[PDB]
Structure formats: C-alpha cells, structure tokens
Amino acid sequence: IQTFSYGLDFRSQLEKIRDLRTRFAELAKRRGTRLSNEGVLPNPRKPQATTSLGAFTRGLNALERHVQLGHQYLLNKLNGSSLVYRLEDIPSVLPATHETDPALIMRDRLRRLCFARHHDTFLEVVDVFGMRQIVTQAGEPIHLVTDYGNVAFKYLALRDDGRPLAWRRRCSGNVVTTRYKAITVAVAVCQTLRTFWPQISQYDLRPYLTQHQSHTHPAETHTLHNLKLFCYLVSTAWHQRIDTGTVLRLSLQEFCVLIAALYPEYIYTVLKYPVQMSLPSLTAHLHQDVIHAVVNNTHKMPPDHLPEQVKAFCITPTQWPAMQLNKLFWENKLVQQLCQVGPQKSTPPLGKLWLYAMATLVFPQDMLQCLWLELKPQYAETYASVSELVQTLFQIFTQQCEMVTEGYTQPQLPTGEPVLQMIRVPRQDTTTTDTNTTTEPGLLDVFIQTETALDYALGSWLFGIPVCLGVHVADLLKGQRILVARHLEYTSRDRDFLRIQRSRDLNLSQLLQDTWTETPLEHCWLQAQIRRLRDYLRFPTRLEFIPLVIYNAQDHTVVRVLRPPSTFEQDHSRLVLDEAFPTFPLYDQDDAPTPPVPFNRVPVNIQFLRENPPPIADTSRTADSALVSTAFGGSVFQENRLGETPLCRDELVAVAPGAAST
Amino acid sequence: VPSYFGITQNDPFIRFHTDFRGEVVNTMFENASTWTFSFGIWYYRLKRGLYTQPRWKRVYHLAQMDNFSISQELLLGVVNALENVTVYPTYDCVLSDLEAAACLLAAYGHALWEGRDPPDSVATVLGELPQLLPRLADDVSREIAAWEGPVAAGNNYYAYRDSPDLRYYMPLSGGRHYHPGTFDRHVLVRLFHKRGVIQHLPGYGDDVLSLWSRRLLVGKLGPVFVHEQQYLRSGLTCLAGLLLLWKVTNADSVFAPRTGKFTLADLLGSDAVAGGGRVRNFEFLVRYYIGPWYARDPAVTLSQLFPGLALLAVTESVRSGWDPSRREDSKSNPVADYMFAQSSKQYGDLRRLEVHDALLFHYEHGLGRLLSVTLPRHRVSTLGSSLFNVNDIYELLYFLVLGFLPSVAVL
C-alpha cells in the first residue's frame, strides 16, 4: 500500500483485505482465543511475537477504514465536479518518482490544515503504517479530508520559501505603452475641462489677440488660455461647415470635450502653430460625417473606424441591456466549485483570486508587467509586480488561521491509534460581537467586492474570450448618450490577441512534480483537473465577439457592462451646437491660403500646457513631446526576435520597444 | 494558375486567369442586365457628345439617345485609354514608376531603416510601406506647414516651371538635358534636398540614392540617376499620387452605413459572392495589387493599378480653368481625343504621342489640386458623388480601382 504497487484499484485492495480478515478469523477460531478490539495497532518496529491477535484485528480495521474512506472521498469529488464523469477515466500516477521529505511533508500537512472548510479539532498520531500523521475526531487523515482544490493553490503553499521568486532570478531578465499613456493624457484633460468649465468659460480671450502683446499673462494662465482658445477655435471651425431622424443640441463645453477626445492632435496643433495659420485648416479638416458616425455609434462594436481615425465613440444606454461577465470568467459554477474550499464559510469565493493566480503563473512575465503598468489599480498601487498581490494575499490567508493546543485525557481514540498531540484551530476572523459594528476592511475585503478592468482583461486572455474596454468620459444629453473612449478591444482578427493564446503554456505538469507530497489519490485528481482545464482552455467558447466593458479612470473600477441589441436603425441625428457665448470678430483675414496643419502627433507629456502661447503668423519637440497616430493605431503587442542565446518565456514575447518608453 | 485580388474588406480574393478588368466588365454586362444600369452623369454627357458625331457613333455603337445605359466597348475604351495615359515606350519604360517611388522613399527612409533590419529587395520596401508612410506623411506635412510661398505658390506640388513650348514628356536632347528649375517648385524636392536625399540637381538652387538604385537594380536587370533622364518626374508624381490616395482613403473606414443601392452581390449574382483583419485600408490592397501583381508583371505602373482617379483629376483641372496650352501665359473633353487618335491608324504616331502627352500633363495638373487643398478627401468625395454616383467609400474604393461605378437609376 505504501509503494502504491496496485495503483488506483481500490476494489482489489478491499477484497484482499476482507480475505485477509477471513484467514485471520479462521486462525483465531482455531486457537480458541477470543478477539480483543481494545488493543493498539501493531508496530513494525516492535517484535511481531509480542504483538497480539487483537492488535492485528485493529490494524486490519485501520487499513480497511483508510481504503473505504479514500474510495468515498473519490466518489464525493466525482459527484461535486462535472468535468470528470466516471472513476476509470483517471489514470494511476506512477510511483517512479519516490521522494519523501519529512520536514516538507510536515509543512505540507500544516499548510493544508488551514484549508479545512470549517474550524475543526485535529490531533497528531502515527498511522498503522508507522508514519506520523494528523487525523480528525472521526480519524480522517489530513491529506484525505482536506484538499487544496487547485494544483496551483497547492504549489503556492510550498513555493513561499525565502525569496519571493527564484524562477525570475534563473531567467535573469518599468515600460509603459503609448496607447495607455495617450488615453490617460486625453482623459485627464477632458475631465478637467468638464469639471471647471464655468471658470474657463469666463476667461476673456479677446484682449490677448487685440493687444498683440504676448507672454504678459502668468505661467498658470498658459493652460486656461490654451484650452479655452482651443475649443473656441473648435467652435469657429464648426460654425462654417454647417452652412453647406432627431435633432440634438450640444452645449459649447460638450462640443469642446467631444472634439478634444476625437483627435488628440489638436491640442499640440494649437501650441505648434498660430491661430491665424490654423483657422482655415482647422475649419476645413473637420467635418460632419465622422462626427455623426461617432455620436450615432450603436449596434456596432468594435467601432467601424480604425483606432487611427477615431478615438472615442458614443453609446446609447437604453438600447444596450445588462450582461454578467462574472459568470463567464470567475463566477462560473465550475470555478466556484474549484474555489469553494476555504478556511471558513464566511470567506468569499476565490474564483477571482484563483483567476489572477492563473494569470500570474501561466502567462509570460513581461506581458503581465506591461498589462499591470497599464491597468494598475488604486488599491494595488502600493505593490509593483504582478506576483506581489498573490504573495501578499496568500500571506494574509496564512495569517488568518492560528494555532492553540489542548490536551486530551484519553491517550487513545476508540480506533486505538496513539495520540501524540492535539491541535486546535482558533477562528480568528474579526467577527466577534464588539458592538462597534465599524472596522477598517482588510485588503481582501475591499479586494473581493471591487472589480477592475484588469480582472476582465486577464479573464479574456486566459479563457480566450473577447472583451472591449471603454474609458468613460461623461454622460451626456441627460444620459441620452454616453462618452466612451477607445482603450482596448478584443477581436480574433488581431494578430497580438491570436498570438497570446498560444504564448501561454498550458502544460501544468511542472506544478505536479514540483510539489510531490506522497499522496497518489490527490496527485491523480489534480492531474485530472489539469488535463480537463487544458482541454477547456484550448477551445474557447465564442459569443460572436461582442462583450463590452466600461471602467473608471481614477480608481480603475468597472462602471457598466453592455450588449448590442439585434435590431438596428439609422439614427439620422442632426447635431446643432447651441450658441450662447459667441466668437470674437475675425481680424485682417477677410475681404495665398495658409498651409494645413499636421494632424499626426498625439502628445505624451503634460508639460506642453505650461508652454507659451503660439506666436502670431523644434523638431525634437515634435518627435518627443508628441507621438505619431499611425504607430498608435497599430497593435502595440509584439514578439521579440529569436537570438543565439535562448530567450525566456517572458522574453520571447514583448511589447514593441520603439513605441513604448523604457 | 489563377491570380488573386482581394482588396475588398468584406470579400475574399477573386480568382481569375487573365484580363482582370476585361473579365470583370464582361461578367458585368453578361450576368446582369445593364438596361437600368447608369454610370455618372459625366458619362452621360460623353454619351451625348459621342452620339452627336456620326462616325464615332458608329465606331462606338450608341443606338439610343435618352437612356443612361453605356455600351460595354465604350467602358473598355475608357479603361484602356486611362491605362495608356501613363505607360510609355519612349524610354521603353525600362524603369517602371513604382520602382522610382520606392527608391525615392527608400533614400529618405534609409535613416529609418537603420533601426530595423536593412532591406535589400524592392518587395521588402513594398512590405514596409505601411511602416514608411507615417513618417513620410509627418515630414511632408511639417514641410507643408513651413511653406511660406517663396516661389510662385498657387498650388504646392510639382512641375510648375515646365516650358510652355515643350509639349513632350521626355526632354528632346537624348533625354538628358533639362530647362533649369523645372522642379524648383516641387514641394518634396524642397523636402529631400533639405534632408540631403538628393544632394545635386541641375538647375536647382555621392547621391546615396543613385548608388543604392544601382546596387539593388543591377541584380534584377542583370540604372538611370535622377539627373540622367526622365526617371526624375515619374517617381515623384506616382509617389505623390500614392500619398494622396493613402490620406484620402484612410481618412474614413469602409464599414460606414451603406446609403447607395449598389452592391457587388447585385453585380456578380448571389452565387458568385456566396462562392467567394480590420486594419488600415491599404493593408488589404498590399498583398494583392502591390506584391503578387508585381510578381506577375513588374513593368505595370500606377495608372494600370488605379485608373479611377484619372477622371477625377482631369475634371478638377478642368474646374480650375487652366489649360495645357496656356500655362498661365477650346475643347473641354481631354479624354475623347486620345480615343479618336487610337480608333483609326491613319493618325500619325508623333501626333498621337503629342496629344497623349498633353492629356498626361493635364492629368498630373489635376492630380496636384487634390493634394494641394486642405480638404483632399472632401473635394474628391463631393466631386465623385456628383459626377460618378459615388454614394459611399465602399463604392469609392470600387470606383477608383475599376474606373467605373454602375448603378440602377432608382430615380
């Protein structure tokens, strides 16, 4: 039984044990001495002759109890999961890998003790086989009654030793992408414009032009003058074009925000070139068709126009019902069943945390670093790398459960095993009736309730499921239309998204051999779970590639989840910009046309707002302070070229270095 | 065996043996009835002008006067004349245009190529066009903004100093000499020369471009410098056209809600479309018109690829009021004169070349204005919708590729 010679055939062990007792009882009756079940189990170290017949009765009872409880545990695990249907589907592990570390085995038992579904009283003994173990009051071995529930959840317990990570040190291998940088630069400015519009609108632009005197106004007034003159010029551009189904009225501030969001090039354009130079080009370059396309985006996602042409798209909330993407990624019944094992019932489901653990362990490190630097949460802002959250939360999980010991007067259980020690697990959760009712939540407590776009992105990458992430700017027209900026959109046609599916390593056997704890049944069940998960992840269920996600910018929290309806109609909106604060008269330009301005530079730094107003009528500044929109539109993620030195898994796939900043 | 053209966003590549334009047109007027079909109203005015002349009425077989239908051979003649607009055997086109544009962009982007793997083939440069176009656009736009109109700046482009007396594309003295300053107003010569791409130019104001052109072309030919022959003009004109097309087409997406009644399914039938991503618009055109069509026939030039824009350029230059003869110092249909010359062999080769080069000069003169205006795509779309029934960009791509856009009147 210790050598696992017979394998998973619990039956043959059962009947040979019954036959063993049959011969035993034959001999017992032949001797004429009654059998006594009060004896202790025989010790292989002790002489065989001194051991009594009743000792062998109790030993055979222990062996049977172990085998049928193993069979029943296997049956319960089969009943609790639909991934496997019948017992013979699991193959026997091989006993070729035979290593037993007593300290590691004891530590594995101690860590697994904290995985009990409720708080329970455990007691440490030596089994009938001669090995130290811990059992419950019913005699359940710890490795049988308690299971980690995941191969990685059991790997991480044995992984935390000394330094946080050694694989990263073995590989021996701070970069933000241009898309996220541009998104933040645009969104912060747009929300700042929306918030303090009464103050900027009251600023008087006329004196600056009429005086023809420059740089008199203070340094802080650079930004306010730039922004108001900016969307003033936007309004002047709008006025001329309209000279050449519902009617929509947009306030001046809202048109400022919309046009600023559509092209990030305008803000750099105003600073780079004078107002008189820009005005004809600004008026002519804009138009009506794309603005109507943006404002009337409905039943269509990802948007028809490429990222280079369009940056934000509007959504009507009433047309799009509510979807629950939690069921798709983590709240699924199978994931919740796998994560159900926990220290106590009051602990939340660990589907989200297990999904993050999957993302950390399976996906390449460089991709994880880049995605974390992009979608860094506010609560996790204190932590740097991706594995830090997992390590910290596992440390907290270890910290919830403590140890207290209490003696037991009877040295033996009714089963007859000698009780060396008894360990009691205190329920140390802060749920005592302090009558205060108010306390500071822990990182786990605020972590479970709050959902992030990083969660959805990791689920999309792991499960091979599409998702569209949209930054929320504001809600318009009394909520009739919603401002959504283009941040991240998944489609099978995208090369990076089809490449990252195969970039991850679905081979999870290393998580099996690297945590061998001399438990064959658990190893076989974990192998079952790994192969079934590999089959599930290799084939991703498709839903016509139409999930949409709206998340906040400041706190990185998901705001709304949408879904397009089947029926569609052309809105045929008529956009009329109301005029209550008109434009100042044009000067010395009416009664060769000026050259156009380049709409090909998206600013990356914020220092431009501090700069001087443009003089009326550097190449390094153009190249560095602002970035080209064409490379912005292209897929950011790429793969590093192979070299003579074998690249790591994380070094093989990397974000393009030219666009991003290191 | 069959060549593949897959420019369409919503359709895979069409498989054909030869004569893609001819086969497509034949299927157009054979599979579907063309009685209710109608092209642009400018086609209808050309129809009236052809009918009123009896000899060319019999040549072109224009039976009825009122209906908007256009005979198939007339469209074939339009397309083939537009093809011949550029193609030249004067230099026997030893060096086709696309290669000239590739070289001119190559010498400018050689600094850009230093970061990535250095290419040694023309096809590699063609594959880098999606990567090379953004920097080229940024630099041409910044140099456009820096333009103060020092030289005569009615419209910024090229060839605003060619002598009115000279009416032929190629310089007369063996193709070497030039009237000094013919290209001073070329905006991109002011760009490259400032960047040092073309260090020396006769009549203006080593040459790593010349060395590179020789080095890559000697293997394929088994070389003509910028100052040597006409190689100068063709590359500049075709690359300017390419940049204009890129800016116009990538300004809007093709998935715009359909407003016209013209669909390829109605053209080829439901069976044909039934039998037969989401990136920049040119990336669908590249590995169908740029690479495999080049492999099939390297000698093909820009006019053959995109005959649709020629009519728009001709119309725009007509609208400007400028004439090839006057050059700022009568007939308003430059398209039909070459047709008349080609119809009968009694026309002299010298006269045919003369009128063909006049039409060509008018063609680049029209090309200049679309890229000289702050609203290129605007003017192109507004003119094309009115004069060719171009209702959508999904239709504009078909028109520019094929040179025509049939449509049931529905009026």
Please report residues of A whose CB lies closer than 8 A to that of B133: 630
Using the structure block, give the residue that is written with the tokens 């001709």. B314
- Give the separation between CA B2 and CA B282, rounded to whole angstroms: 22
* Chain A residue with Cα closest to B117: A641
Is the Cβ–Cβ distance between A422 and A121 less than 8 Å? yes
Q: Helix/strand/coil (H, E, C) string of chain B?
A: CCEEECCCCCCCCEEECCCHHHHHHHHHHHHCCCCCEECCHHHHHHHHHHHCCHHHHHHHCCCCCCCCCCCHHHHHHHHHHHHHCCCCCCCCCCCCHHHHHHHHHHHHHHHHHHHCCCCCCHHHHHHCHHHHHHHHHHHHHHHHHCCCCCCCCCCCECCCCCCCCCCCCCCCCCCCCCCCCCCCCEHHHHHHHHHCCCCCCCCCCCCHHHHHHHHHHHHHHCCCCCCCCCHHHHHHHHHHHHHHHHHHHCCCCCCCCCCCCCCHHHHHHHHHHHHCCCCCHHHHHHHHHHCHHHHHCCCCCHHHHCCHHHHHHHHHHHHHCCCCCCCCCCCCCHHHHHHHHHHCCCCCHHHHHHHHHHHHHHHHHHHHHHHHCCCHHHHHHHHHHHHHCCCCHHHHHHHHHHCCCCEECCC
Q: How many helices (H) and strands (E) does chain A have?
A: 27, 13
The pairing of strands A602-603 and A626-627 is antiparallel
If contacts are CB pairs under 8 Å, which of residues 540-579 in chain A contact chain B?
A: 570
Residue A525 is classified by DSSP as H
A13 contact partners, CB below 8 Å, separation of at least 6: A1, A6, A67
Helix (H) / strand (E) containing A497: helix A495-503
Establish if B141 touches chain A: CB-CB under 8 angstroms: yes
Do the Cβ atoms of A597 and B253 come within 8 Å? Answer: no
Q: How many CB pairs under 8 A join A and B?
A: 81
A353 contact partners, CB below 8 Å, separation of at least 6: A339, A390, A393, A447
Give, in degrees to the nearest 5, the angle at Cα A469 between A465 and A470.
155
Helix (H, G, I), strand (E, B) or coil at A519: coil
- E strand map for A409-453: 419-424
For residue A359, what are its two tokens? Answer: 């993302």
**In angstroms, what is the C-alpha Rg of chain A?**
34
Q: Considering CB atoms only, which of B134, B254, B255 is closest to A631?
A: B134
In A86-125, which ranges are continuous DSSP H helix?
102-113
Q: How many CB atoms lie within 10 A of CB A583?
A: 13
| Cα torsion B221, B227, B233, B237: sign | positive
**Letter for the amino acid at A659?**
A
Q: C-alpha distances in angstroms, A469 versus A479, A490, A565, B254?
A: 20, 9, 18, 23
Q: C-alpha distances in angstroms, B80 versus A207, A360, B4, B87, B304?
A: 61, 61, 21, 11, 9
- Give the separation between CA A269 and CA A45, rounded to whole angstroms: 88
- Give the separation between CA B227 and CA B182, rounded to whole angstroms: 12
- Give the separation between CA A148 and CA A493, rounded to whole angstroms: 39
CB-neighbour burial class of residue B170 (10 A; exposed 0-12, middle 13-18, buried 19+): middle
Q: Considering CB atoms only, which of A284, A491, A597 is closest to B375?
A: A284
Please report residues of A whose CB lies closer than 8 A to that of B280: 306, 308, 633
Candidates A146, A268, A240, A333; CA nearest to A622 is A268
Establish if B111 touches chain A: CB-CB under 8 angstroms: no
Do the Cβ atoms of A304 and B147 come within 8 Å? Answer: no
Please report residues of B whose CB lies closer than 8 A to that of A290: 252
Classify residue B283 as left (phi > 0), alpha (psi -120 to 50) or beta: alpha
- Give the separation between CA A242 and CA B227, rounded to whole angstroms: 49
Classify residue B148 as left (phi > 0), alpha (psi -120 to 50) or beta: alpha
- Give the separation between CA B269 and CA B280, rounded to whole angstroms: 28
Using the structure block, give the residue that is written with the tokens 């008529």. A574
- Give the separation between CA A458 and CA A446, rounded to whole angstroms: 19
Phi (first) and psi of residue A418, to 5 degrees: -75, 125
For residue A591, what are its two tokens? Answer: 């009664």
For residue A396, what are its two tokens? Answer: 């907290």
Q: C-alpha distances in angstroms, A461 versus A466, A469, A489, A491?
A: 8, 13, 12, 12
Candidates A592, A542, A546; CA nearest to A565 is A546
Q: What CA dihedral angle connects B302, B305, B310 and B313, to 10 degrees? A: -60
Is the Cβ–Cβ distance between B108 and B226 less than 8 Å? no
Candidates B172, B98, B160; CA nearest to B354 is B172
Phi (first) and psi of residue A188, to 5 degrees: -60, -45
Beta bridge partners of A476: A481
Helix (H, G, I), strand (E, B) or coil at A397: helix
Q: Determination technique for this PDB entry? A: cryo-EM
Q: Considering CB atoms only, which of A277, A290, A630 is closest to B252?
A: A290
Is the Cβ–Cβ distance between A616 and A212 less than 8 Å? yes
Is the Cβ–Cβ distance between A483 and A186 less than 8 Å? no
- Give the separation between CA B55 and CA B51, rounded to whole angstroms: 9
CB burial string A63-92: b at 16+ within 10 A, e below: bbbbbebbbebbeebbeebebeeeeeebee
Establish if B2 touches chain A: CB-CB under 8 angstroms: no
Using the structure block, give the residue that is written with the tokens 């052309």. A570
CB-neighbour burial class of residue B98 (10 A; exposed 0-12, middle 13-18, buried 19+): buried
- Give the separation between CA A3 and CA A24, rounded to whole angstroms: 24
Is the Cβ–Cβ distance between B304 and B96 less than 8 Å? no
Phi (first) and psi of residue A364, to 5 degrees: -60, 150
Residue A555 is classified by DSSP as S
- Give the separation between CA A445 and CA A443, rounded to whole angstroms: 6
Establish if B275 touches chain A: CB-CB under 8 angstroms: no
Please report residues of A whose CB lies closer than 8 A to that of B252: 289-290, 305, 309
Please report residues of A whose CB lies closer than 8 A to that of B135: 628
Helix (H) / strand (E) containing A190: helix A178-195
Residue of B136, B253, B255, B371 to mutate when probing chain A, most A C-beta within 10 A = B253
- Give the separation between CA A109 and CA A124, rounded to whole angstroms: 10
Give, in degrees to the nearest 5, the angle at Cα B326 between B321 and B327.
80
**Letter for the amino acid at A44?**
P
Residue A474 is classified by DSSP as E
**Is the N-terminal amide bond of A302 cis, ω within 30° of 0?**
yes
* Chain A residue with Cα closest to B280: A306
Q: How far is CA B6 from the centre of its chain?
A: 19
Helix (H, G, I), strand (E, B) or coil at A534: helix
Do the Cβ atoms of A493 and B255 come within 8 Å? Answer: no
Do the Cβ atoms of B253 and A633 come within 8 Å? Answer: no
**Letter for the amino acid at B24?**
V
Please report residues of A whose CB lies closer than 8 A to that of B145: 273, 277, 595-598
For residue B50, what are its two tokens? Answer: 């052809």
Is the Cβ–Cβ distance between A212 and A613 less than 8 Å? no
Establish if B152 touches chain A: CB-CB under 8 angstroms: no
Beta bridge partners of A424: A121, A404
Is the Cβ–Cβ distance between A94 and A350 less than 8 Å? no
Establish if B156 touches chain A: CB-CB under 8 angstroms: yes
| Cα torsion A262, A267, A268, A274: sign | positive
Using the structure block, give the residue that is written with the tokens 């419209």. B155
Do the Cβ atoms of B149 and A306 come within 8 Å? Answer: no
- Give the separation between CA B385 and CA B395, rounded to whole angstroms: 10
Classify residue B107 as left (phi > 0), alpha (psi -120 to 50) or beta: alpha
Q: How many CB atoms lie within 10 A of CB B353?
A: 18
d(CA A290, nearest CA chain B) in Å = 8
Please report residues of B whose CB lies closer than 8 A to that of A308: 250, 280
- Give the separation between CA A33 and CA A24, rounded to whole angstroms: 12
Q: Considering CB atoms only, which of A309, A493, A600 is closest to B252?
A: A309
**Letter for the amino acid at B26?**
N
Is the Cβ–Cβ distance between A585 and A205 less than 8 Å? no
* Chain B residue with Cα closest to A592: B154
- Give the separation between CA A195 and CA A32, rounded to whole angstroms: 97
- Give the separation between CA A175 and CA A154, rounded to whole angstroms: 32
- Give the separation between CA A165 and CA A389, rounded to whole angstroms: 13
What DSSP string describes A323-371?
Answer: ---HHHHTSSHHHHHHT---SSTTSPP-HHHHHHHHHHHHS-HHHHHHH
B347 contact partners, CB below 8 Å, separation of at least 6: B340, B341
What DSSP string describes A274-310?
Answer: -HHHHHHHHHHH--SHHHHHHHT--S-SS-SS-TTT-
Establish if B135 touches chain A: CB-CB under 8 angstroms: yes
Residue A119 is classified by DSSP as -
